Write an enzyme that holds these catalytic residues in place. Structure first.
Site, short mmCIF file in Angstrom:
data_model
loop_
_atom_site.label_atom_id
_atom_site.label_comp_id
_atom_site.label_asym_id
_atom_site.label_seq_id
_atom_site.Cartn_x
_atom_site.Cartn_y
_atom_site.Cartn_z
CG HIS A 1 -0.56 0.30 2.49
ND1 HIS A 1 -0.33 -0.70 3.42
CD2 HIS A 1 -0.33 1.47 3.13
CE1 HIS A 1 0.03 -0.15 4.57
NE2 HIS A 1 0.04 1.16 4.42
CG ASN B 1 17.03 13.77 14.85
OD1 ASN B 1 16.17 13.20 15.51
ND2 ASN B 1 18.17 14.21 15.38
CG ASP C 1 -0.09 -4.07 2.80
OD1 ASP C 1 0.51 -3.56 1.83
OD2 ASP C 1 -0.59 -3.39 3.70
N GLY D 1 1.96 6.42 8.86
CA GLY D 1 3.35 6.80 8.64
C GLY D 1 4.29 5.68 9.06
CB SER E 1 2.21 1.91 6.36
OG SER E 1 0.95 2.24 6.86
N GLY E 2 4.56 -0.30 6.43
CA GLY E 2 5.73 -0.80 5.73
C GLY E 2 6.93 -1.10 6.61
#
Ligand code: CA
Length: 236
Positions: free
Chosen positions: A45, A61, A93, A185, A187-188
């Site tokens: 996704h 950072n 996914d 944010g 995800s993955g």
């Protein structure tokens, strides 16, 4: 990442930040794991659109040039053939990114250890989710990499009607279910689990409850990495 804390800089060396170009800027959108010098594993996704990608290795950072980062571009994206963006709960996914060049491995940049094919974690296995995602539902992204204790929850519990029920498949891993969770944010990114004293990447963050990121009894759901070892080997 909701809950947890800011990680010590460069303590999860295989964690990567996947960003896309917009004008002169690059925006973080997903996490991922460096699995080979020129290969990254992330969620389908995150890359099922034609965007100009930037992969950052050795990052801590996001807004500062610290000197340990390795900026990389993507040569090719391989999305699992079973992926259906219209139905994230169907599974599959997962995606692999072939980078344009190979990473220089060092103290800040290292390869993730993947589990043996079909390996299943026992209930309550110590794991940590890592990422730069939202620090609360609808909250801001984190400039610094965060980590949060997120122990595994076995399939029997996770698929019970009180939890995710039939939404979770056997090709997925659940973790948490309490105050700590992944969020937009993240995800993955990886679900780092300690097995026999070492950290292995057992999951690729896929989804959370639609009501809220850390919804009670709605553990963060990850693509089970061990179910795709042969697919990955067939591609790499
Ligand atoms: Ca930086």
């Amino acid at each position: 990442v909701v809950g947890g804390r800011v990680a010590q800089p460069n303590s999860w060396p295989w964690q990567i930040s996947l960003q896309y170009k917009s004008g002169s800027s690059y925006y973080h959108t997903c996490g991922g794991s460096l699995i080979r010098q020129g290969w990254v594993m992330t969620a389908a996704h995150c890359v099922d659109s034609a965007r100009t990608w930037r992969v950052v290795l050795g990052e801590h950072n996001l807004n500062t040039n610290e000197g340990k980062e390795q900026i990389m571009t993507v040569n090719s994206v391989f999305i699992h053939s079973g992926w259906n963006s219209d139905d994230v709960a169907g599974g599959y996914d997962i995606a692999l990114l072939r980078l344009n060049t190979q990473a220089s491995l060092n103290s800040a940049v290292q390869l993730a250890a993947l589990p043996p094919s079909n390996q299943i974690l026992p209930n309550n296995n110590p794991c940590y989710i890592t990422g730069w995602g939202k620090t609360s539902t609808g909250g801001p992204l984190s400039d610094s990499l965060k980590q949060a204790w997120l122990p595994s929850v076995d399939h029997a519990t996770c698929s019970s009607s009180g939890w995710w029920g039939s939404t979770v498949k056997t090709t997925m891993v659940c973790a948490g279910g309490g105050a700590n969770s992944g969020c937009n944010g993240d995800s993955g990114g990886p679900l780092n689990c300690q097995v026999n004293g070492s950290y292995y990447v057992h999951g690729v963050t896929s989804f959370v409850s639609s009501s809220g990121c850390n919804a009670s009894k709605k553990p963060t759901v990850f693509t089970r990495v061990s179910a795709y070892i042969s697919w990955m080997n067939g591609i790499m």
